[PDB]
From a paper:
Echoviruses, for which there are currently no approved vaccines or drugs, are responsible for a range of human diseases, for example echovirus 11 (E11) is a major cause of serious neonatal morbidity and mortality. Decay-accelerating factor (DAF, also known as CD55) is an attachment receptor for E11. The capsid consists of 60 identical protomers arranged with icosahedral symmetry and each protomer is composed of four capsid proteins, VP1–4, derived from the P1 polyprotein. DAF is one of the regulators of the complement system, inhibiting formation of the complement convertases in both the classical and alternative pathways.
In order to improve the density and characterize the interaction, symmetry expansion and selection of DAF occupied sites by variability analysis was performed. This analysis also indicated that the average number of DAF molecules bound per particle was ~20 and improved the density allowing, where there were contacts with the virus, some larger side chain orientations to be determined. SCRs 3 and 4 of DAF interact with E11 at the southern rim of the canyon via the VP2 EF and VP3 BC loops. We also observe an unexpected interaction between the N-linked glycan (residue 95 of DAF) and the VP2 BC loop of E11. The density for the glycan is not well enough defined to describe the interaction in detail, however it is clear that the BC loop of VP2 of E11 is involved, centered on Lys73. In the E6 pose, SCRs 2, 3 and 4 of one DAF molecule and two protomers of the capsid are involved in the interaction whilst in the E11 pose, only SCRs 3 and 4 and one protomer are directly involved, with the glycan of SCR1 interacting with a second protomeric unit. In support of this, it has been reported that a single amino acid substitution G162E in VP2 caused the loss of E11 affinity to DAF. Our structure confirms that a longer side chain at this position would clash with DAF in the E11 pose, so VP2 162 is a key residue controlling DAF binding pose.
Author numbering:
A (entry chain C): 43 to 237
B (entry chain B): 58 to 261
C (entry chain E): 35 to 285
D (entry chain A): 96 to 113, 247 to 287
Write the structure that this text describes.
């Protein structure tokens, strides 16, 4: 099954209200202008429990298991116009402290600065930093894995005649060191009577 | 050489609000020259496919498409109690269109794009062979699909081996006076086609 | 008076219940079952002087039944008025409305030696209606094709209401076949007013809210939000309704 | 047929042939055993905003 988990799957990061049944659930809104103070997105690293990940290929496979271990790949693709340029700071903050409220705080954690260009995708690899060898899929505070946030490193600059609002998509997969165990039934399927 | 060649289907218009399109194969080619003719006179068929999708737009257009081939894309009916018409799955060279909302009606597919007409996560379709068409990056997608089935050969009319889906995750967007018509064109070529069970042509 | 009229093979005389016939009586014969009278021949005798009937020759012979009724084609003149079809008779058909000729196929039937008509082929095929097209934010149900006599029905996706005809039929229209009714339109359904809340506001309230659109609430300074930060428009049976109660702002 | 109890059905339908050609796990609820019919299902569950990460370090 780990072969399946290592395949990128689109992440409904924008799991907001109303856009739970659109395609926009898979799009992170970004735009030109002075919006550095405004955070782009943020979520907890709960690949099988958080609503952001639990229904992805990685999340669904994990829900059949009680323990998981290994690194996670978050691939971000810029889906704007080729004439749009920008830079973003993708940060992973291990647990122990509240989520950052500013780019200064997030930069202090594990981060990568993404430059938009001919290569439209960048990968933020979440390393396995845990006191335990395994984490619970039904994560608690003891097995918390941290958070991921994005900030405008510089911003988005576009020329005349170019759309000012752009979108980003996030894909999630498992690295080659990922592993799960303790097979269990999944809570995403239920019935009340024989079909 | 008479069947293993590129056939181009009718193009589709990618609008700002376009849930997506799909085509079932080999039904989509039941009228493509001698490839369709061999299909009508034979009981068994077996062919790989080279699918080429084309969508060209300026560098001032932004958009992203998902081109994915789904083996055994058994669709589901909007009416949970009932079946689907062949017409609800495939119109031949004409594409079936997804929807941005739940669909109703008798014998019609539940074509809400989020569930992909199969009761699954649309974002999880990357497990199948797939490519993306990011207008800032590329303008075409190519997938080489061999023959996948639980049997060495099968009837091309009674069975749809795989379904080709095109789903824009990022809606097409442009500016004041850029080109508004951005089409998507699909070109498919059978590969290593074989036929068996020669007899009179079937009639639909 | 003559006695019984002469026996004629495969014909029966109308005697009308008597057995002695005055002079000049004319008796007519009718052919028996599976026999047809031969045009241009006498079918009657007459009682002559000397109590003697005039001679009559066999005037009945064979034929196929009237050709069976086809939904696709009708017999051409003069076959459509005829009932005498001896072996070797070839009739011709023409397409009924809703159908058109398949040129590679013959529209003729031959009466065979076993008194049956030859095998029927689809020399007239169904006339087809145009492509029904597409309904924006709706769907066309085509359950059995688009040929002459077909039915199709229209519906709208969740959050849209149908205005126009709900169905259409492929019916004959002069020289061809056409759809009875045009495609309908699926107009977006509008939800009721998102309810204001005590000690809170709606953030940038809009004029009209359609399917799945959301209203975001915010409490005034010094007030604590209890409930959903926003609600959204649901649409069922062509009627909109908010997903639930707005939040409370408590002091 | 393994299509009337939902858990084993969902486990088996993670592959097209049984394993070959894995499929995205069934997101929607099964309706009957004859078909794959489903009611339209949300992609996932909602949260408060796109940046919403709740504080866990607080007194
Ligand atoms: C003496 C009693 C013997 C009981 C026999 C019970 C099972 C006999 C048939 C087994 C074949 C079915 C095996 C399971 C496969 C599934 O039904 C599907 N075809 C696979 O998705």
């Amino acid at each position: 099954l780990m072969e399946i988990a290592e395949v990128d799957s689109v992440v409904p990061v924008n799991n907001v209200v109303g856009k739970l049944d659109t395609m926009d659930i898979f799009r992170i809104p970004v735009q030109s202008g002075n919006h550095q103070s405004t955070q782009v997105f943020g979520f907890q690293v709960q690949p099988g429990l958080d609503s952001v990940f639990k229904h992805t290929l990685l999340g669904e496979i994990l829900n059949y298991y009680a323990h998981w271990s290994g690194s996670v790949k978050l691939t971000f693709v810029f889906c704007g116009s080729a004439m749009a340029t920008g830079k973003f700071l993708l940060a992973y903050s291990p647990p122990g402290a509240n989520a950052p409220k500013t780019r200064k705080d997030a930069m202090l954690g594990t981060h990568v600065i993404w430059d938009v260009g001919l290569q439209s995708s960048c990968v933020l690899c979440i390393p396995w930093i845990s006191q335990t060898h395994y984490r619970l899929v039904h994560q608690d505070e003891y097995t918390s894995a941290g958070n991921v946030t994005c900030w405008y490193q510089t911003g988005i600059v576009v020329p005349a005649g170019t759309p000012t609002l752009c979108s980003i998509m996030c894909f999630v997969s498992a690295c080659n060191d990922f592993s799960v165990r303790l097979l269990k039934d999944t809570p995403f399927i239920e019935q009340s009577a024989l079909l | 050489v008479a069947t293993c060649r590129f056939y181009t289907l009718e193009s589709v218009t990618w609008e700002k609000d376009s849930p997506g399109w799909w085509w079932k194969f080999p039904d989509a080619l039941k009228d493509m020259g001698l490839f369709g003719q061999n299909m009508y006179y034979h009981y068994l068929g077996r062919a790989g496919y080279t699918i080429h999708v084309q969508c060209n737009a300026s560098k001032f257009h932004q958009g992203c498409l998902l081109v994915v081939c789904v083996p055994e894309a058994e669709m589901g009916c909007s009416d949970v109690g009932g079946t689907v018409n062949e017409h609800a799955i495939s119109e031949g060279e004409i594409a079936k269109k997804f929807s941005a909302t739940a669909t109703n009606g008798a014998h019609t597919v539940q074509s809400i794009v989020t569930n992909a007409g199969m009761g699954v996560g649309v974002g999880n379709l990357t497990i199948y062979p797939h490519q993306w068409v990011n207008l800032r990056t590329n303008n075409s997608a190519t997938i080489v699909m061999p023959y996948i089935n639980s049997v060495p050969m099968d009837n091309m009319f009674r069975h749809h081996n795989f379904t080709l889906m095109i789903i824009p995750f990022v809606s097409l967007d442009y500016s004041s006076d850029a080109s508004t018509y951005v089409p998507i064109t699909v070109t498919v070529a059978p590969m290593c086609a074989e036929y068996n069970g020669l007899r009179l042509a079937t009639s639909l | 008076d003559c006695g019984l009229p002469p026996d004629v093979p495969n014909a029966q005389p109308a005697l009308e219940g008597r057995t002695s016939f005055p002079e000049d009586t004319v008796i007519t014969y009718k052919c028996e079952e599976s026999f047809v009278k031969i045009p241009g021949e006498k079918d009657s005798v007459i009682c002559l002087k000397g109590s003697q009937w005039s001679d009559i020759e066999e005037f009945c012979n064979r034929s196929c039944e009237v050709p069976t009724r086809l939904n696709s084609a009708s017999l051409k003149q003069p076959y459509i008025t005829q009932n005498y079809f001896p072996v070797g008779t070839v009739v011709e058909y023409e397409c009924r409305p809703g159908y058109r000729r398949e040129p590679s196929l013959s529209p003729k039937l031959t009466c065979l030696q076993n008194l049956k008509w030859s095998t029927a082929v689809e020399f007239c095929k169904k006339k087809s209606c145009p492509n029904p097209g597409e309904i924006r934010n709706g769907q066309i149900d085509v359950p059995g094709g688009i040929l002459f006599g077909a039915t199709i029905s229209f519906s709208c996706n969740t959050g849209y209401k149908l205005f126009g005809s709900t169905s259409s039929f492929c019916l004959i229209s002069g020289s061809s076949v056409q759809w009875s009714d045009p495609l309908p339109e699926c107009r977006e359904i509008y939800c009721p007013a998102p309810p204001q809340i005590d000690n809170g506001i709606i953030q940038g309230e809009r004029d009209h809210y359609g399917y799945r659109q959301s209203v975001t609430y915010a409490c005034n300074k010094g007030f604590t939000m209890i409930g959903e930060h926003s609600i959204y428009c649901t649409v069922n049976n062509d009627e909109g309704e908010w997903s639930g109660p707005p939040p409370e702002c408590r002091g | 047929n393994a299509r009337r109890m939902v858990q084993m059905r969902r486990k088996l339908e993670m592959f097209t042939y049984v394993a070959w050609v894995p499929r995205p796990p069934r997101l929607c609820q099964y309706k009957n055993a004859s078909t794959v019919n489903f009611s339209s299902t949300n992609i996932t569950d909602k949260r408060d905003s796109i940046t919403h990460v709740p504080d866990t370090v607080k007194p």
